[PDB]
């Protein structure tokens, strides 16, 4: 049972949800910025 | 010399516009990267 307390999770599941939502928003905004500069040419 | 002056002015104007655009773009990238933190 101690060896199955080892795994790798320690935060409350609310904190896991907060981390997952924040990281989802991060990947969204970074992909949106990179797509903006994919589409935008400052020159003609 | 007048004609060469206006020609130099035109090329400087095009370069200035392109520089201001790339400068503002780099500033926006820096703002986004600092806001993500």
């Amino acid at each position: 049972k101690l060896i199955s307390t080892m795994p790798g999770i320690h935060l409350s599941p609310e904190q896991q949800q907060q981390q997952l939502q924040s990281l989802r928003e991060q990947v969204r905004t970074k992909n949106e910025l990179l797509q903006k500069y994919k589409s935008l040419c400052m020159f003609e | 010399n007048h004609e060469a002056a206006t020609c130099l002015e035109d090329v400087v104007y095009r370069g200035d516009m392109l520089l201001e655009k790339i400068q503002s773009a780099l500033a926006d990238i820096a703002q986004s990267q600092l806001k993500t933190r």
């Binding site: 992909n31 797509q35 994919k38 040419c41 020159f43 | 095009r14 370069g15």
Partner: peptide, 19 residues
Amino acid sequence: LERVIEMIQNCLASLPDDL
């Protein structure tokens, strides 16, 4: 000016290849 333009272009040519 030309060099800067093509420089910007190839970096833009790099970025959808990351996307």
